[PDB]
Design a protein around this ligand. Structure first.
Ligand SMILES: OC[C@H]1O[C@@H](O[C@@H]2[C@@H](CO)O[C@](O)(CO)[C@H]2O)[C@@H](O)[C@@H](O)[C@@H]1O
Length: 416
């Protein structure tokens, strides 16, 4: 019986599970694995269990999590301790964190999108694999005078450099194999047989990877886990051509987009008048990506989006922007409008849900780092702590809760 496995509907316009439509009432929780680790490897398991419980009470049925991270552990801007400090060598204390993450998600009947790698630097990612291959541990982190474009050209050698790509992909493939074949030490399930996992996701946000790379990798992931969906992890921030290069492949089962107004220069959170322009952008983003998904006849999930706190209330004070006590009136309206639009599109089966970025839970940006230097919450350590996290008692919690109720209501209407 594969009844419990999330599937694509035979008409391609949404997901199914248990013989019924399945809508994604999601959140991002990439920190789950590290919080699930035992106290010795810097975890806080009781807090992870409470965070999952908090999320179940807000109606969340789906977490996108990180199922990779690379050392070596002396690197800035990344998760510590790492899951894979050197190629093929695993921090078992961190890996057991993933086991518990998946076991707790099961008890709350959530599904997981298992992200297998990262283009960005905060879990090591593609840039780290490249560093292992060239033997050169000086990654050009985009801090100070180094730009994102320069870091991107370095990391993109993972799949564009005809000498580096085959060796890098060999290491990445060994990691994919190890994760798909992990026996969960808590409940005994082998990951590739676990219906709790909705999909394997190639990577977070690959930047202009060639078509033949998505073709190859997705095929390999699917042969590795034939019961599961496979996903690309693309932002879809460019155009339809870019979207097709990632998604038009027999083993990419559904499509995704990521919407970042501040990061793309669309939205300035210090500007008291900037919200309407971000709302409109979110608005055309959802309508146009929706059309691109429909042209491939595959489902679409907005698997990342977010907004900063109300920095415009005190524009000239940088620290104010990240304080938990700072309100989120813009973020709240932005989330609410996007959610209302998704609910309306999902009613005509032209969108399948979303995962906000990202749940902070009980973490706060004012807390001290743990002994490995981590202030765990929704913002990875390449970014200011507290930028986008949604905290357990934020006003945005009610908005997300209502959205998850509306989206479940729609899934029920469609199940008739
Ligand atoms: O910044 C929030 C969240 O965004 C994702 O990555 C962003 C992408 C979005 O376009 O662009 C960057 O800002 C680099 O320019 C990158 O950090 C998300 O996947 C995660 O990495 C990040 O926390």
């Amino acid at each position: 019986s594969e009844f419990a496995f999330v599937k694509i509907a035979s008409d391609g316009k949404g997901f199914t599970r248990y013989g019924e439509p399945y809508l994604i009432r999601g959140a991002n929780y990439w920190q789950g694995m590290n919080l699930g680790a035992d106290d010795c490897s810097g975890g806080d398991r009781k807090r992870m269990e409470l965070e999952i419980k908090q999320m179940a009470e807000m109606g969340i049925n789906n977490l996108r999590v990180m199922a990779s991270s690379e050392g070596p552990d002396d690197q800035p801007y990344r998760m510590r301790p790492s899951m894979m400090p050197q190629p093929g060598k695993y921090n078992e204390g961190v890996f057991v964190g993933l086991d518990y993450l998946l076991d707790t998600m099961d008890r709350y009947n959530m599904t997981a999108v298992m992200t297998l790698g990262n283009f960005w630097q905060w879990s090591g990612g593609f840039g780290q694999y490249v560093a292992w291959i060239t033997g050169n541990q000086t990654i050009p982190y985009p801090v100070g005078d180094v730009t994102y474009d320069e870091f991107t050209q370095f990391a993109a050698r993972f799949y564009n450099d005809s000498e580096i790509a085959p060796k890098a992909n060999k290491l990445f493939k060994d990691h994919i194999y190890t994760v798909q074949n992990r026996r969960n030490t808590v409940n005994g399930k082998i990951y590739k047989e676990d219906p709790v996992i909705m999909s394997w996701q190639i990577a977070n946000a690959p930047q202009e990877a060639p078509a033949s790379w998505f073709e190859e990798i997705s095929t390999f992931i699917k042969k590795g886990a034939p019961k599961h969906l496979v996903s690309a992890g693309l932002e879809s921030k460019l155009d339809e051509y870019d979207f097709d290069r990632a998604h038009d492949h027999k083993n990419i089962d559904y499509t995704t987009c990521h919407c970042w107004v501040e990061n793309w220069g669309i939205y300035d959170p210090a500007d008291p008048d900037g919200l309407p322009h971000a709302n409109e952008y979110m608005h055309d983003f959802l309508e146009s990506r929706s059309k691109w998904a429909a042209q491939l006849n595959k489902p679409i999930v907005m698997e990342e989006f977010g907004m900063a706190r109300d920095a415009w209330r005190n524009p000239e004070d940088e620290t104010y922007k990240y304080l938990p006590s700072t309100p989120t009136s813009h973020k709240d309206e932005y989330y609410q409008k996007a959610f209302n639009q998704i609910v309306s599109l999902a009613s005509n089966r032209s969108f399948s849900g979303s995962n906000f970025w990202a749940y902070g839970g009980e973490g706060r940006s004012t807390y001290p780092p743990n002994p490995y230097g981590m202030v765990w919450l929704g913002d990875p350590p390449h970014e200011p702590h507290g930028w986008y996290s949604v905290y357990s008692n934020d006003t945005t919690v009610q908005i997300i809760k209502d959205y998850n109720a509306n989206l479940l209501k729609v899934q029920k209407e469609l199940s008739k």
